[PDB]
Amino acid sequence: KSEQLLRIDDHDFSMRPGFGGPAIPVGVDVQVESLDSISEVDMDFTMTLYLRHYWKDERLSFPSTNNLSMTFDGRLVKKIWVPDMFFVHSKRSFIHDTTTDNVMLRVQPDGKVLYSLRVTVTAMCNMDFSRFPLDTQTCSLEIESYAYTEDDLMLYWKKGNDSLKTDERISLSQFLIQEFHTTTKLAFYSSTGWYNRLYINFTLRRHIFFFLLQTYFPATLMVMLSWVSFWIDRRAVPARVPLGITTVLTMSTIITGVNASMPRVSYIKAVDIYLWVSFVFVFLSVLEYAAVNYLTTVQERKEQKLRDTHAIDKYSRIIFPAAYILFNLIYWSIFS
Amino acid sequence: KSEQLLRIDDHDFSMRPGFGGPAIPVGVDVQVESLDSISEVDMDFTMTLYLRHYWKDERLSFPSTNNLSMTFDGRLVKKIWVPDMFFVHSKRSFIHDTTTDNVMLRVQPDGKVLYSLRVTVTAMCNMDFSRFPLDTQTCSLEIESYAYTEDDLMLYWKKGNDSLKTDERISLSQFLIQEFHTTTKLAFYSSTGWYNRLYINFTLRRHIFFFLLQTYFPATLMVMLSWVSFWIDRRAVPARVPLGITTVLTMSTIITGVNASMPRVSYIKAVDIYLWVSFVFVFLSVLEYAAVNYLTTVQERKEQKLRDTHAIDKYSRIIFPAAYILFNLIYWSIFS
Amino acid sequence: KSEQLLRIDDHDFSMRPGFGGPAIPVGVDVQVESLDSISEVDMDFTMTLYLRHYWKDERLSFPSTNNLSMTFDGRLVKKIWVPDMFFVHSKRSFIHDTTTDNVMLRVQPDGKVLYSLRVTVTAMCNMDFSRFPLDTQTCSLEIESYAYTEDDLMLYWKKGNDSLKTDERISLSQFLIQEFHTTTKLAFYSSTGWYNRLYINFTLRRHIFFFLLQTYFPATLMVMLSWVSFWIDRRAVPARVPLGITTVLTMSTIITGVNASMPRVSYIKAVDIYLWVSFVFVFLSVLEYAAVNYLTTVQERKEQKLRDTHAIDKYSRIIFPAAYILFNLIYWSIFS
Amino acid sequence: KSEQLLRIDDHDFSMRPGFGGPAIPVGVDVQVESLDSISEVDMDFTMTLYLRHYWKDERLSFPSTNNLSMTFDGRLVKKIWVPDMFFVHSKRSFIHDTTTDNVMLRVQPDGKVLYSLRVTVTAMCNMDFSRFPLDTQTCSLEIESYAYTEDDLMLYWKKGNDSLKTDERISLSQFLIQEFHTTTKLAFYSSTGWYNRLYINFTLRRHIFFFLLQTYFPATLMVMLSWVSFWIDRRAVPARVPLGITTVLTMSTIITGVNASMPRVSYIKAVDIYLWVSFVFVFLSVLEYAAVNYLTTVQERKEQKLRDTHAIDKYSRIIFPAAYILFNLIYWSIFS
Amino acid sequence: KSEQLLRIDDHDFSMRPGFGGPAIPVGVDVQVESLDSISEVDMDFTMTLYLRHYWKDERLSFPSTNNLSMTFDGRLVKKIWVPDMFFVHSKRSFIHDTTTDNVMLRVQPDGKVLYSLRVTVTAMCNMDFSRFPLDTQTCSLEIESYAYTEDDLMLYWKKGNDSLKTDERISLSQFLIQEFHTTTKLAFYSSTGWYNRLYINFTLRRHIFFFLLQTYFPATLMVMLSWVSFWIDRRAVPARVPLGITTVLTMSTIITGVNASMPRVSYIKAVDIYLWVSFVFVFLSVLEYAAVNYLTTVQERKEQKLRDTHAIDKYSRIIFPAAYILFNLIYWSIFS
Ligand SMILES: CCCCCCCCC(=O)O[C@H](COC(=O)CCCCCC)COP(=O)(O)O
Ligand SMILES: CCCCCCCCC(=O)O[C@H](COC(=O)CCCCCC)COP(=O)(O)O
Ligand SMILES: CCCCCCCCC(=O)O[C@H](COC(=O)CCCCCC)COP(=O)(O)O
Ligand SMILES: CCCCCCCCC(=O)O[C@H](COC(=O)CCCCCC)COP(=O)(O)O
Ligand SMILES: CCCCCCCCC(=O)O[C@H](COC(=O)CCCCCC)COP(=O)(O)O
Ligand SMILES: CCCCCCCCC(=O)O[C@H](COC(=O)CCCCCC)COP(=O)(O)O
Ligand SMILES: CCCCCCCCC(=O)O[C@H](COC(=O)CCCCCC)COP(=O)(O)O
Ligand SMILES: CCCCCCCCC(=O)O[C@H](COC(=O)CCCCCC)COP(=O)(O)O
């Protein structure tokens, strides 16, 4: 029996190696397989990865006439000591078990142990949508020991920045993934003390041109279309009035459709500012012709009682485009 | 073997410590890690937290030449007595088990025991949306012993109000979280008797300006736009009629879009009152010109058979804005 | 050891108490904690409740010098006999297990046993939406023994109608819950014989005024608005025609929005009848002016070749409101 | 002990009864409790049912002084041989376990065994929506032995067509269920050989009148409304043009709303053909007046340079309704 | 006992057959039962299949007087060595267990072993929607040994390209499935070394005519309808202006409805290019009449101060259709 080469019953496997002495170093290597999905409303993402641990235990040394190693499955985990790593700020996770548990153990003759498992984890990531759709989001994944402090277990990246590997075909449907790197930081808990924590960082970006074409283009086109009425004769009321009211209706429908296709985030974003400024512009373009018509009627009635182009249109033709251009300059300087 | 230092087989671990005597005090400390999501339709929220228990058991005392403690994992839980806390008014919950069970046990030489576990719980919270979107909701989380009454187990916060800690980056997408505090209350069950219950309370608020801009602004703009027709000559029927009917259509589309983006709550809210009052105003603005046109036609026909501005417009120009301002004053005094 | 006071190994616990003799009575008490959700499309509801069983077993009697009882957790269930209750016409259910199994056992010195557990169950409930939104739905929850007939196990409510308790704050977002009561009925299975079944009944109702305001008000307003054209001069075709066609468009949009916000139930309801009758009314209001215009053109052409208000408008002004009022009377007499 | 009456340890229960001889007959009875839901997009349905097996085993015979039987729960399944039935072409299934496993075993003194369990199963069902909403779908449920061929296990319906029972109140929200019957067929696998398979068949139908009223009625009404313009004077351009363009807009909105409420099936159906033919009709009704207006302008200009009803309208008034009636006749003859 | 014919306790089943010598060949056969669903947003698909393994082990040989084999269920798996196959780039998977585990083992007298199980797996598949709806997607399923390299376990298709079988009625609601074939490729891992990987490839296609009719037809019809105004007299402003603005509104509504029914993929596709070019065309058709009207007014005013068809319309009638035809030619040459 292979388990009789390792004196399992001659040692206590409820304690860490080197109990009572210096802490044992444990190295961690991570390979990212894929990113499953990302949820903006709940602010989380799902990742599938390989987790590997490296440590040495003299109690597992066995004699041999060569340098061959022994490989064991997940059934030997319950009989030996293994590190109790867990993912910080996670919501749910599981280990794949088809067609059997995806756990592997390799033991060297001198006691070096490799422990590898395949896991899927969902972790939280706070996001800020104030600059949507020009926002940038940075999410991280954290790994920490649960019950062992820095005095008993020392956690580190085995090969520094080379310990993280990513798949060549990792991608997201609506996001761009970039800038993968690893960092470490010490965390303190008042109940037990200090812990070592490992981080995996990456950055997310959107496709700007899609949102520009879908949102900013129709609003600008409708605003420029609302300026057509300034070049129409003031005497054609049944042409000036329906044009303005239908432009208002079209802008309202465009705004509603754009809102219906965005994530349900309940605070003001830049796109909302742009759309409502456009709506205000169309509203003012309607009030302008209302005032022109009233003044024309008053003047005609006064002339009849006593017995060309209106200046308001001339000034509006210059003022409205200049105001819109100034607003666009300020907006795109603020939001880059 | 570490388990041979504790005389497990020499004691009965099916009974609580101090059986037959005074009740044993048990202290509870809670650290809130994050709030996962909140559902308005089903009236529940999801929270992830750390739960810690403190109690003393003389049966676990072991001799030692120093003051070092022993740490055990979840496998020792089944061999000793642990408190049976459960969450009241919960719908579903689970304990994380990646890469292993997130359960820790620490035993002091004098018998003091610390029992900590990481859990995710979904709990109910009744909500009232009558004052939406100016509503305020208070939700709580309750912890109680399942099988032990106050005569056998005494439950309390270990350090009073300092026993609750919250993460610095806890937030919700569409809500503001504030006013975390802890309270206790005794509960009675006729089947068994009195129990001690612990509470964790917090308050939720919305973003008012977003809803104001998205809902109240377009309705007010459309109502003010409907008053433009009072300044147009009564003789231009093909300009007065289409303007009113298109304003009605635009208001209807705005109301439908607003309803489509709100939670499916089937009772009357303040926003509905505002929108339908606006719809009634636009309807009356159409009936007014209908009456003016009919009266003008009647007068002209009578004059022809026998062979300026209509007073209704003059009175409407004053009455409609005054009525709308009065309605807004009353509404915003009632709903603050 | 507490389990050595009960002669577990001296008795066979695979058979019911009193085997070979009269059936053993078993009492059931239910406390409803909350209603989680209700699904109209799938016709089911979710409930969380406490289930308690009472029975006597002489094999569990133990000597004592006082009248104290012993409390055991879920681990003793597998060593003794317990009733095998199950929920009839259920889809899915589970027993909560955080932080441990929510199962309690209390044994009296004379052999009386109390068995309590906390369970969540999803059960079917057939619904009829013909009278929507004025429909009333009655749902029930059923409890029955699985393997024991009335000859071996007699099931009953322990305290009659007092055996059902409900939480003070039980509520639903879009429904009103009322009339909780308990009933019993005998059921027959040809494979095994008769069984005793217990019922928990309740009634659901909606909020009428919300649906009235959201649906019936806009349709009536649009129908009344379509009657405005009968008071406009027949000579203003560019005012009569666009008004009618835009009214038809507005009614169509209102009907589509109302349909988009209702549950996806694929058969005719009362609200559909109301909306389509309104649509037919607006259609006829357009055909009426078409006929008036054609007749006016024919008369003018005939007069020119040979070389006031049209009666159709006068009759329509009376006929249309009277027909609509009669339809409303009949509809609200049929649907109350 | 009841298990000592059956010589469990004196026989090998890893082999089927009658090993090495003729195959053992096994009878199956099924009672359908309810249909939970049906998914058109994923093409599957969910059913809850009772499954019963009948077979004889001489190794379970026990002496008795009467004719009473012994009932055992799910714990005896692991100690005896039971048939390994499974559902073919299923996606997911489970056995209910509240408050315990819903498994029953009854053993007669002569060795007859009844094995009953309650199960919920989701099975695939290919559907064809070409004739939607006049389509008819037939779904089936299949039961087969997993590891035993016809040479070792003979599977059949115990009582022929009487072995299937259905609940009196089984129904679906949007479907009609009818024609339940049972059939058998032999299946061949090249790896192992022939198997016996059992079928449960039923048919699904929709509610025709609901879809007719919701879809075909508005399209026909709009098409008939588009013919009104042929009776209006050609000299009223501001009445002819807006009517046609608004009719086109209304038809487009109706088509979009109808598409938004149908299942997301990506191929052409009959309703799409009807709606797009109607759209083409309205388009042609607009081109007709465009041509009439151009011809009238040309004629007037020619007459002025040189110095009644247009025939196109007269022919259109007859041609358009006749063409639409012919199309409806052909369509309803093809699609019945 | 059947398990006593196989000397289970006389051999170590923790090591592979032929340990220390040449690698053991293992053959794999796959039968695809159905495709459950496909998700475009998350880029994955679900498949149900049968997995079979073939290998020889001399340690399982048993004496017999004939050539009959022994069949064992899933309970023997834990006592013998079985290959540890797993699915690469999968997200979740499970093995069906109703009414029992769907695992079968057949052992020949000479030691040949057949191991078959029924599994459901969800796997990732990167997709590109740039050419939507004319895109073609190729997805694959990968099988690899977890812990054994090519030096210890040699994995191959048992019968080459005949080892893959597919159901006759496999289909998808919105996709066409074709070109099933099998390939192999060697993969390298720096931690352990080389592995053998098996592939199952297939291709997906859409229904072109449905998307054409739903999207390209209405846009072309609206663009052609916008050219009607070039044939209308320039003196009818209340007919030219509302037609153009309503055409713009109709195009906007069509674009919004089309966007609302497509998968939420956030980058530019071909259909978007087509729709926005059409929108630009309608915008230019409105600017053209604006310019014509302004020029006509200027000319009339100049003539009055001093005291036929406009050329712009004549040139537009030719230029606009030619430009649209050229754009369609270029677009359909680029996108085929
Ligand atoms: C947005 C709607 C503005 C309403 C018109 C403002 C009332 C001023 C008015 O009518 O008095 C005008 C004064 O004209 C101007 O002030 C020219 C500047 C135009 C500003 C418009 C951008 C009376 O006209 P008149 O005495 O003939 O010059
Ligand atoms: C909302 C629609 C109201 C319909 C018009 C009311 C009919 C009264 C009418 O026409 O008689 C009017 C009386 O005018 C008034 O009462 C002035 C007050 C205006 C109230 C309007 C806010 C007849 O006109 P006249 O005899 O010339 O003054
Ligand atoms: C105008 C002054 C402000 C009104 C305050 C409304 C408070 C009344 C209230 O909250 O009880 C409301 C009733 O609301 C209304 O009466 C709607 C009025 C319709 C207006 C447009 C047609 C309770 O109704 P409900 O919860 O559905 O039982
Ligand atoms: C819904 C559309 C009805 C179309 C008009 C009906 C054609 C009858 C017609 O034009 O002949 C009319 C007869 O008028 C009437 O019958 C008065 C009753 C009005 C009924 C309308 C509710 C011819 O007009 P005349 O000979 O001048 O009276
Ligand atoms: C769908 C739009 C059809 C455009 C008009 C067709 C051009 C033919 C034309 O204008 O020449 C017409 C010929 O009229 C006809 O052909 C009568 C049949 C009407 C067919 C309409 C259904 C010229 O008018 P005229 O020489 O006065 O008869
Ligand atoms: C008018 C007479 C009735 C037509 C019967 C259509 C049967 C043809 C059929 O089912 O094959 C259909 C083709 O349908 C059409 O041709 C649509 C015509 C467009 C009309 C409006 C533009 C098969 O198409 P598909 O399943 O997408 O491959
Ligand atoms: C898309 C909107 C184009 C605006 C009109 C362009 C201004 C040019 C203008 O008005 O000067 C025109 C010149 O006409 C032309 O250039 C004929 C070509 C028409 C090109 C239109 C496709 C002045 O008119 P006229 O001196 O009488 O010829
Ligand atoms: C007219 C001739 C056909 C155009 C072929 C477009 C191919 C270019 C391409 O695929 O790269 C596209 C760019 O598409 C456009 O330029 C949109 C043009 C807007 C037109 C309406 C405003 C890549 O863009 P993206 O994936 O978002 O980085």
Ligand SMILES: *[C@@H]1O[C@H](CO)[C@@H](O)[C@H](O)[C@H]1NC(C)=O
């Ligand atoms: C390799 O194994 C041989 C035994 O076969 C041993 O003598 C030698 O020292 C080993 N070398 C290393 C580097 O482990």
Ligand SMILES: *[C@@H]1O[C@H](CO)[C@@H](O)[C@H](O)[C@H]1NC(C)=O
């Ligand atoms: C790892 O590489 C990243 C790449 O930017 C760098 O920021 C980081 O400092 C590096 N860390 C170490 C420990 O080398």
Ligand SMILES: *[C@@H]1O[C@H](CO)[C@@H](O)[C@H](O)[C@H]1NC(C)=O
């Ligand atoms: C600490 O441990 C020492 C033994 O090393 C013991 O003598 C001393 O009393 C302990 N002190 C406390 C406060 O426990």
Ligand SMILES: *[C@@H]1O[C@H](CO)[C@@H](O)[C@H](O)[C@H]1NC(C)=O
């Ligand atoms: C805890 O602090 C909260 C803060 O408002 C207070 O309301 C509550 O009374 C305090 N309770 C105790 C026990 O101090």
Ligand SMILES: *[C@@H]1O[C@H](CO)[C@@H](O)[C@H](O)[C@H]1NC(C)=O
């Ligand atoms: C209560 O317990 C006492 C023993 O302490 C016993 O003598 C007495 O009979 C009991 N009474 C009842 C009602 O059980």
Ligand SMILES: *[C@@H]1O[C@H](CO)[C@@H](O)[C@H](O)[C@H]1NC(C)=O
């Ligand atoms: C229980 O109370 C309800 C209340 O209406 C009543 O209908 C029912 O008959 C009662 N049943 C019994 C057994 O008292």
Ligand SMILES: *[C@@H]1O[C@H](CO)[C@@H](O)[C@H](O)[C@H]1NC(C)=O
């Ligand atoms: C019924 O049981 C009696 C014993 O009580 C036995 O004598 C008789 O044969 C049995 N009959 C049948 C039909 O099993």
Ligand SMILES: *[C@@H]1O[C@H](CO)[C@@H](O)[C@H](O)[C@H]1NC(C)=O
């Ligand atoms: C069972 O009844 C159905 C009812 O139509 C029939 O079609 C079928 O042939 C019958 N089968 C047998 C075996 O009687």
Ligand SMILES: *[C@@H]1O[C@H](CO)[C@@H](O)[C@H](O)[C@H]1NC(C)=O
């Ligand atoms: C078949 O079995 C017989 C024993 O019944 C044996 O003699 C013969 O060799 C076997 N043949 C093969 C091909 O295994």
Ligand SMILES: *[C@@H]1O[C@H](CO)[C@@H](O)[C@H](O)[C@H]1NC(C)=O
């Ligand atoms: C299997 O058949 C496919 C069919 O196209 C072919 O492409 C492939 O090369 C074949 N592979 C082998 C190993 O025959």
Ligand SMILES: [Cl-]
């Ligand atoms: Cl006009």
Ligand SMILES: [Cl-]
């Ligand atoms: Cl619209």
